[PDB]
Design a protein around this ligand. Structure first.
Ligand SMILES: Nc1cc(C(Cl)=C(Cl)Cl)c(S(N)(=O)=O)cc1S(N)(=O)=O
Ligand SMILES: [Zn+2]
Length: 258
């Protein structure tokens, strides 16, 4: 695994292997609210997820992923800036080494403690995730800023599952879960054209960033950081952080739905 988040293989070094790191549509960004453009043409975000599409949780070494069956349109995102239906395939989190930072997106310079990514691919235009992932209109990702405070009970199934995937490569079934339960009450959002926030950093993402945060406790964040990046039997290496710094807007417009 050439890339990671440590001093030698981390975000400031990704450009050596992935020159798109220094591109014009890189994510995440700082959303400066004085510079957002309210767009009257934005429709409300519509999510409709079937809990039976939940499939598997996986320790991928730098993070963990919760994957969904994506063979049909049982679980879809519509509305907002999109004409096309986008098919749910994954959610995951980013976090930092301490409570002070850990989100990827920031709002008016303010860093949150963690961030939820709910990822979808354009099944109107493309035939698979692998095809869509490199296309400018291929991916739609909802970002939710997670503010340290009260324990969030909606995270329970996810946190309880981590003990079965402690080390790199471990995976387990993760079923009967609707991740719309993790979204805030308001789906008021910012949107901008951007990228995956880690390699391969493709500029394929329409970002949908929620205005409203969701909560997370200090102890729930500790559960994320207690996951191990090493394989079973090796020296324990906690997953301390996996958030990328904010990237230059390079003249992009962040639009507001509100
Ligand atoms: N950084 C990143 C990478 C991927 C991956 Cl691992 C692929 Cl192999 Cl496409 C994906 S995804 N949704 O897994 O295709 C999303 C992101 S993110 N953090 O939401 O921008
Ligand atoms: Zn992410």
């Amino acid at each position: 695994p050439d890339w990671g988040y440590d001093d030698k293989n981390g975000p400031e070094q990704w450009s050596k292997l992935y020159p798109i790191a220094n591109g014009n549509n890189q994510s995440p960004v700082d959303i400066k609210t004085s510079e957002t453009k309210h767009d009257t043409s934005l429709k409300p975000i519509s999510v409709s997820y079937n809990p039976a599409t939940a499939k598997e949780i996986i320790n991928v070494g730098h993070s963990f992923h919760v994957n969904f069956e994506d063979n049909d349109n049982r679980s879809v995102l519509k509305g907002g800036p999109f004409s096309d239906s986008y098919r749910l395939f994954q959610f995951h989190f980013h976090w930092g080494s301490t409570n002070e930072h850990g989100s990827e997106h920031t709002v008016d310079g303010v860093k949150y403690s963690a961030e939820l990514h709910v990822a979808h691919w354009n099944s109107a235009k493309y035939s698979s995730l692998a095809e869509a992932a490199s296309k400018a209109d291929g991916l739609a990702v909802i970002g939710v800023l997670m503010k340290v405070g009260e324990a969030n009970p909606k995270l329970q199934k996810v946190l309880d599952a981590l003990q079965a995937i402690k080390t790199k490569g471990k995976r387990a079934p993760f079923t009967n879960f609707d991740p719309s339960t993790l979204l805030p009450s308001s789906l008021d959002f910012w949107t901008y054209p951007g990228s995956l926030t880690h390699p391969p950093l493709y500029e394929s993402v329409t970002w949908i960033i929620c205005k409203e945060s969701i909560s997370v406790s200090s102890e729930q964040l500790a559960q994320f950081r207690s996951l191990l990046s090493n394989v079973e039997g090796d020296n324990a290496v906690p997953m301390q952080h996996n958030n990328r710094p904010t990237q230059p807007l390079k003249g992009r417009t962040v639009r507001a739905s509100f």
